[PDB]
Structure formats: C-alpha cells, structure tokens
Amino acid sequence: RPPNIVLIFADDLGYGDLGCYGHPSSTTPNLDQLAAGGLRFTDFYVPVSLSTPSRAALLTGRLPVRMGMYPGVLVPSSRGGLPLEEVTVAEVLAARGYLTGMAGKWHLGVGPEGAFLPPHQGFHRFLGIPYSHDQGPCQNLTCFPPATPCDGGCDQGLVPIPLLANLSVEAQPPWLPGLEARYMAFAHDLMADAQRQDRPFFLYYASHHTHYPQFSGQSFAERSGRGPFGDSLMELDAAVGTLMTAIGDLGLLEETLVIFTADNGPETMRMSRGGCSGLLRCGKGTTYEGGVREPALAFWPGHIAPGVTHELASSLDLLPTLAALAGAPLPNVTLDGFDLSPLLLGTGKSPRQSLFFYPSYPDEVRGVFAVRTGKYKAHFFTQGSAHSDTTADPACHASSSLTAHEPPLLYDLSKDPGENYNLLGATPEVLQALKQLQLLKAQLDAAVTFGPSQVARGEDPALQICCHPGCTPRPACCHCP
Amino acid sequence: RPPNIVLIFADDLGYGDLGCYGHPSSTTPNLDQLAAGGLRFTDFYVPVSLSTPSRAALLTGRLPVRMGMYPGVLVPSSRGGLPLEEVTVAEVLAARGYLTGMAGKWHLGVGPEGAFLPPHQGFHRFLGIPYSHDQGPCQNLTCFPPATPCDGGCDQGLVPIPLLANLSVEAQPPWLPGLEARYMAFAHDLMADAQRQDRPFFLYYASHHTHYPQFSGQSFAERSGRGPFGDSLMELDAAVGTLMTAIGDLGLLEETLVIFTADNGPETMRMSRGGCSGLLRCGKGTTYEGGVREPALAFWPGHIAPGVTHELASSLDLLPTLAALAGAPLPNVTLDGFDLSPLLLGTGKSPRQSLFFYPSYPDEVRGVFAVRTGKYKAHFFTQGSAHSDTTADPACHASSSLTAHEPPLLYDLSKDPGENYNLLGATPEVLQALKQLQLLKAQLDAAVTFGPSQVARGEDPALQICCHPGCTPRPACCHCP
Numbered sequence A, B: 001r002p003p004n005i006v007l008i009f010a011d012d013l014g015y016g017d018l019g020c021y022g023h024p025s026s027t028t029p030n031l032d033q034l035a036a037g038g039l040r041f042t043d044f045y046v047p048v049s050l051s052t053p054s055r056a057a058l059l060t061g062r063l064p065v066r067m068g069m070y071p072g073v074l075v076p077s078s079r080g081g082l083p084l085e086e087v088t089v090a091e092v093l094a095a096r097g098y099l100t101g102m103a104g105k106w107h108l109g110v111g112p113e114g115a116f117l118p119p120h121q122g123f124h125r126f127l128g129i130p131y132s133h134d135q136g137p138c139q140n141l142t143c144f145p146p147a148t149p150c151d152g153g154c155d156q157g158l159v160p161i162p163l164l165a166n167l168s169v170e171a172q173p174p175w176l177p178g179l180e181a182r183y184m185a186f187a188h189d190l191m192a193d194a195q196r197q198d199r200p201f202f203l204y205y206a207s208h209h210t211h212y213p214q215f216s217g218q219s220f221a222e223r224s225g226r227g228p229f230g231d232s233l234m235e236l237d238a239a240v241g242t243l244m245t246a247i248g249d250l251g252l253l254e255e256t257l258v259i260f261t262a263d264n265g266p267e268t269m270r271m272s273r274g275g276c277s278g279l280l281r282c283g284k285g286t287t288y289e290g291g292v293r294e295p296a297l298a299f300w301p302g303h304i305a306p307g308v309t310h311e312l313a314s315s316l317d318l319l320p321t322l323a324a325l326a327g328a329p330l331p332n333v334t335l336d337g338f339d340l341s342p343l344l345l346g347t348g349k350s351p352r353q354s355l356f357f358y359p360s361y362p363d364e365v366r367g368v369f370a371v372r373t374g375k376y377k378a379h380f381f382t383q384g385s386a387h388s389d390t391t392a393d394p395a396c397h398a399s400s401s402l403t404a405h406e407p408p409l410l411y412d413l414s415k416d417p418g419e420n421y422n423l424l425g426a427t428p429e430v431l432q433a434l435k436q437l438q439l440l441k442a443q444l445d446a447a448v449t450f451g452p453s454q455v456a457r458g459e460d461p462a463l464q465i466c467c468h469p470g471c472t473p474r475p476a477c478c479h480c481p
C-alpha cells in the first residue's frame, strides 16, 4: 500500500537553474516533464544554506542547531558526525518494512571506523562518496572524457575521494565520467529487488551535480548549450529520466512518489561554472532568498494533480510527510516540520505558516537571522559570503560583514521576492507583521537549546579513509582506482 | 487562406514577469497556457528600450534611427511623428485585403489635426490612447475601483488623456477600470465583422499594462497575489484568454496566428509597482539584456508545434514574417529584419545571426552601443538609466554615466546571460568573436544614415487634443468624461 519513494537531492543548484524555473539556456527536459505533470513549488526552502546542515535537516526533520551540525560543514578528518541517536527518514521507513537505499553524497560524518556512514543510520544499501567530491585533490582527475581535467585542483593535502560500497572502498578515486552509470545501475537493482520481495522501496539519490568541480559522462560533455555547468546539469536531468524509465518498466508509475529539490543556493563564486538564483538575491552561504529558496517538484501520477502551489514548505517537512504517507509513526522527538500530504493530495492547505533561517556560523546570543511569516520576511542580522561573491550586488560579498538590523529589514516577498525594498526604510498590516516576526524570533531563540557542536570536536588525519590501510606515505599512497 | 493575425504588445513588461518565465507570484494562467501549446522564445529582442522607438521598429521592420524616432519618446505637444511615407505592417496587410484594427497605445505621433494617428497608417479601425496613459494628470483618476486613486500624479500641466475612436475623442479622460472591457468589445466586433465578410482580420492590441500607473477593472483589483503590478498583469492575462475564447467561438482556432511580446524591459524605478527582468541585468532604458530581451510567445494550433526555441529573433523580424505568412509583398525599402516562418513552422532555422542595439539618445559619432552575434554580446558603450534605478546593481543607475569600452566588454550569453563576467577582463574562439563583433559594428555604423529627428522638431501645446475645441482655460477645460 505505502508508495515507493524516490527522493532526489541536487547539490548547489539555484532557484533559476531549471528550464521550468525560467533559465534561458539550461537543458533539463526530463525535469521540465516532471513539473508539467506534477506539483511545482514556488516557495520551498532549506533552513541553512550549506551542505552538511541542509542534509541533516532533510534526513531528521530537525533544525541543524539542535544536534550540533554547525558551524560550517564537515571535512574528511572530522571527528564529528550526525549523532547515531538521531532518527533519520531511512530509519523510519525501514521499520515499516521499506527496502531503503542511498546513492551519492552523504556529508554527515565518517568517523572512527565509519561509525557515522549511512549503513548505521538506516540504509540497507549505499553506493557513494562520504563528503563532497571536491574535498580531495583533483588536479589529476578527468572531469569530462576523454581527457578534460577537473578545473582548479580542489582541496589539497588530503586522501583522494573514495567511492564506498556500504563500508568498503570500491575505488579511490573513482572515475567521475562514469559515476552516473554506476549510480543508475545501483538504483535499478534496488527497485527490482524490492519489486521481487513484494516490498516498498525508498531511494535517496544525493547527486554530486551541480557542485564544483563540474563533470559529466561522455554523452553530455559539451552538449548542453550552457558549458560545463550545463553539461553537468543535463546529466543530472538524464539520470532523472532514467529513474523514471525504470519506474515505468516495472509498472510502478502510479505507485511511486518522486520528490526533487536541492540542498542550497548556487555557488556564484564559480562564476559561469556555478548556478543561478534567478530573480532572487545572492546565493549559497547566505540567508537571502537566493541561498535558501530551492526548486522543488513532487510527482505521483493519479495522486498529485499537475499544478503550481505558492504555499509554504520546507525540506524539514519531508520526514513527517513521508512518515504519514507510509503509515510509519514519528520518532518521539521535537520535530520542526509538518505533514504536507493534504497539500500534496489536494485535500488541504500547507499547515506551515513560518520559516526560521540560521546562518552558517550560528550562535546563541544572536539567534535566528531571518524569519518568514506569510508573505513577510524580516532579517535581524545580514551577512555576505565568499560562496556568493563575484556578482554585482555588494550585499552578497564576503566583504559585507555581520550587521545587526533593529528594527529588522522587512520585505514583502509576494511583491518583492528580490528583497530590494525595505518596508520600514508604518501601515497597520506592516506593523502587525513586525510584532509577530519579533515575537516568533524571541520565542524560538528562548526555546531552542543548541546541541554541542560536532564540527568543533576537531579533526584527526588518521580518520581519513584509505584504500590500502597502513600504507606509506599517507595520503598519496591511499589509492586504488 | 492567409491566417487571421493577432499581435499583442504589452508595455514595460520584463523577461521574468510571466508565470511561464519563472516568476514566483505573478498570476498569468492564460499566457502560461498559450506557452504550453505554442512556441516560447528564450532569446527574443527589441532593438531600443523605450516606447516610441520600439513601437516604430515593430510596425515598420526598420531600425528607429532610420526614420528619426529618437532621441527619447514623443509627448502630447510633439510636432513630430512616424513619417507617413513609412509603410507599416497594417498597410501591408490591408493591401492584401485584411480588415485591420488597433486597440490601445499608439505613441507614434498625433500631429497637426491628427495627421499621424493610426487611421492614416493603415488601420481601418482604432480605439485607444495616442500616447502613454501617464502622459497627462492622474492625481484625480481612479486606478482601481471603487475609488483607489492612481498613485503619484503622472505628468502635469497637460490635457487629460483622451480615449479616441479613429480621429474623434470618445472620452477625456476615460474611466481606467473599464478600458479593458471597451477593448475586448472592439476586438470581438472586428473579428466577427471580418468573419461575416469572408476576410482575414489583423488585430494590433497594444495594452497599457503593465505601464505606470497601474490600474485594473474590479474583477482583478487586489486578486492577483502580487499587488497592483500583479492585478494589472492578471487583467492583461484575462484579456488574452478573452481574445482566445472569441477565437474559439467563431471556429478560428486553427486559422489564427497569435503573437505575444512587449515593447521594452521593466521600469524598476517604480520599485514593487514595476516589472522584473528575472536573471537578466537592469531594465528599461538600457542596452543590457534586462531592457531589450522580452518574453515572446507564438501560438497557431496545428501549425506551430509546442516547444522552446533559443534561436535569435527580433520585433524587427515580424513585418517580413507576417508579410510572408499572408502572401503580401514587402515594401520597396531597406528592412532590418527577416522572415521567421521556417522557424515558426518547423521546417527551418532562424536566418537571424546578429542583433544591433542603440541607446535612448543615439548619435552618429558613437554609433550602436552593443552587438550580439551567436552567443556573444559586446558592449562598446555602457550607460545606466533613471528608468532602471533603485536596484542593487550600480551599473543600472542614472548615476552610471556614458562610458566607452575599448576593447568592448564581452559576454557569453549562453553561459552568462546575467552579463557578469567580462571575457576580456584571449582564446581563439573569443578573439574571432571579437573581430567579427567589431567589424559588424563598423559596417553598420558606416552604412546607416540617421533620419532627421522627429522628436527634435519640438513641441507646440496647441497640438494637444481637446474634447471641447476652443474652450478656455486650456488645458483643464479640455474634458468630457
């Protein structure tokens, strides 16, 4: 009865990057076709605009400060990880009998002997890389076949990036032009195996696209007409069409819920090799709309009718929605999202009225940076980020430092989604939205206690995954392509 | 045989304003539905980003400097107008027997006794206003019923805005909340009369939306969820759905070509009461992509198949395309556009490879400001505009003055449609695009001779239209609502 679930989570992809969100040159025909037969969200969000914290919020339905996923993101030598006590979506569904699987980027911790890898947090199967694909040296990797090198090098002084199969190293580094096919094959098998055992599957496809450095297999190389970023986006888009073909082929169309979104806004610092936030301001790394507002599609033929909703939703709402849809019961913890099944099925409205945004480097004295209620968004603190540099708007740059705003900066996102015209720069509607925004910030800051930081537990180079355990010299002896 | 033609031309409407071009809150379901069953252009342009010149280019297929339509726009007291010798699209079709009609804004000159009004340039019928609706005082007009006044006042010291029926004043001023219905009724009659006489009609619907000040009839007032700009946009969108219903009702669906575009980018100076260029830079008044790149839809069921083209097209190409489609012969003059029927019908490619952009205040020493060839656009001169002020990008402001660029600023619009990353800030592809752009600018500047300016022939207040001819005191005695 419970539907099969496929959750596709792109990386560093902006609001204005899909064809259906208005980009003029992107090539994304399969995602356009899922939008044309599904529910396209104009106002969907992540609460924090960096990789680790966004991934924590999606899998647990909880604000990332609650379990210590701040500040910044995890690195290969990190001791910390998403605590084992947190209950992930995969745990929830596994318990109700789903065959659960994951392909792609994890970025929730590796840890002493791989204690924080996906196999320990509810996934029966896992093929992927434990953190971003640029967190290891890439000056010798090929990003586009036959022999176009990845640009710029990536992180230095580290072990090459490992492709893992559950807890084992399958390759190190892997061959980037072929990851996609490896991942389509793993997905195909998980589906067919679940069909064979009469059980609902759960696939978590965390693509590496469209994070730096860009890479694609040879059928996309130089075919998109938007350069490397396009080629990579187009391969993501062809992976989606492949999952949808597999779904067809097994007669699972009307029995599978498919959701597509992305962790955080675009890295405009990669300039024309990075994404596009469309009309929204800034990108990755900030609490402006361009870093937290993501594309989001939901497609379940015969259940979700084609259309466009403007209602509020968050990545935080998808554990509780998915639990509801599968008759699985919610963990016994404070959850920050809601069930959106009425909205999806067309019998209700979203229960969500407010959204709370924390910065990359949060703290307990300052609290949440921005809050949206209804159509109004208030910024109490503002800040630019090096991930959002190089555009003409100077509020996005790393040189725009932390600035308190009292009274906050106040925007009407229905008329001014671009965040240009501060409404307090008076009216009764406004003054009443101002008092509610202030009360919601003070209530949340008074009730949330931050979990102790996982990222500040430091680093240990000995925690790095090595294909040839005990070899020497570390890290470059660690490799087995 | 020749199809019926309906040409809808919006006012001050940006690339990112329709739902189908990605806006998050606009309400435009009828335009979304024409896009979903028609050809949506991602790269369509006007050559000059102001009202008069754009309107001249569309009706004549010629660069506006050729017949003196510069600098700036015409005003009510202007002596000048689009010369009578120019052959307009309406002239072309009338000669092949179309019943030709026009509703809405003309802005191509009034002149001594109305010599330049539409009835003299090929339209059998005309109901509309001879220039923009803000070019007369509006502090006492109602923009939204029952009694919401137009905001800010409009131009002072002038006659109220006249609604004309051919050459006669029907009302002065007209009641803005009802213009739309007046215009739907005129369109309905022109269609049915043409059906009755067995003849092809040509309708030219130059809406006042979404120019300042905004206004709508009462079914849209406060219903769009994007405020006044939205209400006005939504009424434009409901007028389109009305024309399409009328087309249905007479069984003319498969026999009518319908084209939708707009004169120029958004007036961001009206802030949240003005339009949105999406990911493009700046707006009205500039030669950046946000002022010259417009939305554009073409819909002719059973002839134009649904889709998206990225090929180059201009408003300049639509006299010659429309002549071709109706078997009417081209005037005997140098034309700057091309026939796009192959592209529309799906048998060819656009013949257009290059686009030439002039500024609002052109001159013969400087020549064209920017040129696009293929994917590359070069800016030889750059300039901001008061119509594009108030955003965060300082290149759009009136304080960014005229700056020569040598070598030009060079952008790859397929990877960088936002015009952020100057590619000469080297490569053989680039250096060859640079030499071609430079040669195309020098060829065009050497071959075009500017026609003597119509706008500099001055003003005469006695040329103002008056409902009560000879009355006193002028201009406020001129009125007959």
Ligand SMILES: *[C@H]1O[C@H](CO)[C@@H](O[C@H]2O[C@H](CO)[C@@H](O)[C@H](O)[C@H]2NC(C)=O)[C@H](O)[C@H]1NC(C)=O
Pocket: A099, A124, A125, A126, A127, A165, A166, A186, A189, A193
């Ligand atoms: C590693 O871990 C999982 C779990 O054991 C492997 O398990 C699957 O492998 C085969 C089918 O692919 C079967 O032998 C097992 O039944 C199956 N187990 C479950 C619970 O499905 C898996 O192959 C490895 N992970 C992947 C796919 O890389």
Ligand SMILES: *[C@H]1O[C@H](CO)[C@@H](O[C@H]2O[C@H](CO)[C@@H](O)[C@H](O)[C@H]2NC(C)=O)[C@H](O)[C@H]1NC(C)=O
Pocket: B099, B124, B125, B126, B127, B165, B166, B186, B189, B193
């Ligand atoms: C003014 O000018 C035109 C042309 O005379 C008027 O003409 C039309 O009016 C009636 C139908 O609407 C008929 O009496 C005429 O046949 C018809 N003429 C043509 C050539 O179509 C018209 O009513 C006025 N313009 C409008 C519609 O306002």
Ligand SMILES: [Mg+2]
Pocket: A011, A012, A050, A051, A211, A263, A264
């Ligand atoms: Mg990311």
Ligand SMILES: [Mg+2]
Pocket: B011, B012, B050, B051, B211, B263, B264
């Ligand atoms: Mg205009």
